[PDB]
Amino acid sequence: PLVNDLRFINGINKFIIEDYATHDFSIGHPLNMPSFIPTATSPNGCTRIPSFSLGKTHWCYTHNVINANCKDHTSSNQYISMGILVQTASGYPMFKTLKIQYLSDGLNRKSCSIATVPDGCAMYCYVSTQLETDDYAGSSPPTQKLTLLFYNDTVTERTISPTGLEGNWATLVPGVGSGIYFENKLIFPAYGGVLPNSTLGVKSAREFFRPVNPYNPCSGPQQDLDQRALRSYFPSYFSNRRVQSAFLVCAWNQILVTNCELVVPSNNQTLMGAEGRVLLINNRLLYYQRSTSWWPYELLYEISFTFTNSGQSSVNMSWIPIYSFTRPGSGNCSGENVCPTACVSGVYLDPWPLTPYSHQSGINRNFYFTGALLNSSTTRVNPTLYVSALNNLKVLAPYGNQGLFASYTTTTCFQDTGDASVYCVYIMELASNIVGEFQILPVLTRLTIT
């Protein structure tokens, strides 16, 4: 059966710490198992852009493979797998692959998000025919693809044109981080360029968000800072489109015929559009947003939807006030810049929240989250396992030596309800001496909480 070992099924997508109390952390050493993530078979072949979802009954995984240089494009292929958590005699679980699908048909599917769905996986891709910058310069979004891969080896792929895309967008691509399936809804992260003179572009022209770190403020008048923040949404790198995060939401019930819906947040509540991830913990939804724009700290929002009688839906989001570690960036968008600027920079590094933030009783200031960061303010280098509070890092554990190059990281934690062990898997693009750019490594760790 396509189902996790029973000691994990009730420890998945849970808040591990409902204490609201203060805690100290220790991140254990990497636990050895056969990697479920395949490496390149050539020194110069490219494997990048991981997407991982651990669902209650199984997990889904995907990444992009190129038989050429990473910089080189042309077409690429997409490795997709699904499997379960299985306990080993070693004392810890292992990710056991049950199904593999290697999409190699010459269609250049990229920026793909995967989601765990009943009896399988759903992947959202766009078909790339040109440079990303050309994509934003143009007036027409690329082809949007939704593919369904089931345990019974059935694979179905559809082109979709979600409600709200045509006429409003220069491009749209998936947000690379995993999406979720909840309550007959399939929801993916997405982002792209909004045509500033379109209906949507005109309705959202005024909107902007300016997060402030009280412990490291940006000097200037509020109105100047505000207008700079508003203008950061229109980078010239992307042809001054309004770069916008959006949510692809699909009725699972009608997933074979539905064109889906594009639900767009208010930019009063969110930063410039970027890669992201949708999480469902307990039944509260969250959104990770990559810091591509000027704000260097970790972006995590509590979100909620209103699906209006199956009309045009809305989403409300609320920023969790996090400013602890900083992501690397280039130029005036580096990890040291805290001030409003037009930026296309940063790197994908998502958090796994160990605690609720807002709950029924109140707000938890003792919020904790874990992940892998890159210890540098400029360079993608020095991958470091971490646990972080809102204002400060609770614990740090470097992977590898100083000078080890690493890029994207995605983290998922789950609990063994049999022995109460808390496991975190840090999936990170790491530079390998022998295989193509970035062996994507799932390192599994036991997390000790006091």
Ligand X SMILES: *[C@@H]1O[C@H](CO)[C@@H](O)[C@H](O)[C@H]1NC(C)=O
Ligand Y SMILES: CC(=O)N[C@H]1[C@H]([C@H](O)[C@H](O)CO)O[C@@](O[C@H]2[C@@H](O)[C@@H](CO)O[C@@H](O[C@H]3[C@H](O)[C@@H](O)[C@@H](O)O[C@@H]3CO)[C@@H]2O)(C(=O)O)C[C@@H]1O
Note the residues at the interface with ligand X (CB under 6 A). Answer: 119, 139, 150, 152, 154, 195-197, 206-207, 266, 268-269, 316, 318, 325, 375, 384, 396, 402
Closer to a copy of itself by Cβ: residue 77 or 144: 77
Q: Which of 10, 22, 32, 316 binds a copy of itself (CB under 8 A)?
A: 32
Closer to a copy of itself by Cβ: residue 40 or 122: 40
The C-alpha atoms of residue 234 and residue 429 are separated, in whole angstroms, by 29
The C-alpha atoms of residue 136 and residue 233 are separated, in whole angstroms, by 13
Tokens of 10: 């009730």
The C-alpha atoms of residue 282 and residue 80 are separated, in whole angstroms, by 27
> Segment 34-53, which members bind ligand Y (CB under 6 A)?
none
Span from 3-11, 95-103, 293-301, 413-421 in contact with a copy of itself (CB under 8 A): 95-103
| Secondary structure element (H or E) that encloses residue 407, with its range | strand 406-415
Q: Give the one entry of a copy of itself, ligand Y, ligand X, none that residue 318 binds, where binding means its C-beta sits below a cut-off of 5 to 8 angstroms depending on kind.
A: ligand X
Residue of 383, 382, 387, 350 lying closest to 368 (CA atoms): 387
CB atoms within 10 A of CB 206: 9
Beta bridge partners of 110: 126
Least distance CB 155 / a copy of itself (angstroms): 14
Q: Does residue 45 touch a copy of itself according to CB under 8 A?
A: yes
The C-alpha atoms of residue 138 and residue 193 are separated, in whole angstroms, by 10
Least distance CB 405 / a copy of itself (angstroms): 10
Least distance CB 176 / ligand Y (angstroms): 7
Q: Which residues contact 301 (CB under 8 A, 6 or more apart)?
A: 269, 270, 286, 287, 289, 317, 318, 319, 320
Q: Does residue 129 touch a copy of itself according to CB under 8 A?
A: no
> Segment 388-407, which members bind a copy of itself (CB under 8 A)?
399-400, 404
Residue of 261, 262, 290 lying closest to 274 (CA atoms): 290
Closer to ligand X by Cβ: residue 121 or 425: 121
Least distance CB 131 / ligand Y (angstroms): 8
Residue by residue, DSSP assigns 223-253 as: HHHHHHHHHTTS-GGGTT-EEEEEEEEEEST
Q: Give the one entry of a copy of itself, ligand X, ligand Y, none that residue 130 binds, where binding means its C-beta sits below a cut-off of 5 to 8 angstroms depending on kind.
A: none
The C-alpha atoms of residue 372 and residue 411 are separated, in whole angstroms, by 7
Write each residue from 117 to 136 as x if it is in contact with ligand Y (CB under 6 A), else as -, in one continuous string.
Answer: ---------------x----
* Residue pair 382/406 in contact by the 8 Å Cβ criterion: yes
Q: Which of 80, 344, 349, 444 binds ligand Y (CB under 6 A)?
A: 344
Closer to a copy of itself by Cβ: residue 42 or 253: 42
The C-alpha atoms of residue 269 and residue 266 are separated, in whole angstroms, by 6
Q: Going edge to edge, which strands form the sheet with 393-398?
A: 352-353, 369-374, 383-388, 393-398
Q: Give the one entry of ligand Y, a copy of itself, ligand X, none that residue 173 binds, where binding means its C-beta sits below a cut-off of 5 to 8 angstroms depending on kind.
A: ligand Y
Angle at 101 between CA 144 and CA 425, to 5 degrees: 90
Amino acid at 276: G
Residue of 359, 332, 354, 362 lying closest to 345 (CA atoms): 332
Tokens of 135: 């994509």
Q: Does residue 347 touch ligand Y according to CB under 6 A?
A: yes
Q: Which of 22, 42, 184, 330 binds a copy of itself (CB under 8 A)?
A: 42
Span from 74-82, 247-255, 342-350, 362-370 in contact with ligand Y (CB under 6 A): 342-350
Q: Which residues contact 254 (CB under 8 A, 6 or more apart)?
A: none
Q: Which of 12, 17, 49, 94 binds a copy of itself (CB under 8 A)?
A: 94
Q: Ramachandran region of residue 250, left (φ > 0), alpha (ψ -120 to 50) or beta?
A: beta
| Secondary structure element (H or E) that encloses residue 9, with its range | helix 6-9
Q: Does residue 363 touch a copy of itself according to CB under 8 A?
A: no
Q: Does residue 110 touch ligand Y according to CB under 6 A?
A: yes
Closer to ligand Y by Cβ: residue 275 or 298: 275
Closer to ligand Y by Cβ: residue 212 or 404: 404
Q: Does residue 146 touch ligand Y according to CB under 6 A?
A: no
Write each residue from 404 to 423 as x if it is in contact with ligand Y (CB under 6 A), else as -, in one continuous string.
Answer: ---x----------------
Task: Please work out the total of residues on this chain that contact ligand Y, with binding judged by CB under 6 A.
Answer: 11
Which residues of this protein are in contact with a copy of itself, per CB under 8 A? 29-36, 38-43, 45-47, 65-68, 75, 77, 79, 86, 88-90, 94, 96-98, 100, 102, 104-106, 399-400, 404, 430-436, 439, 441-444
Residues that bind ligand Y (CB under 6 A): 110-111, 132, 173, 274-275, 292, 344-345, 347, 407
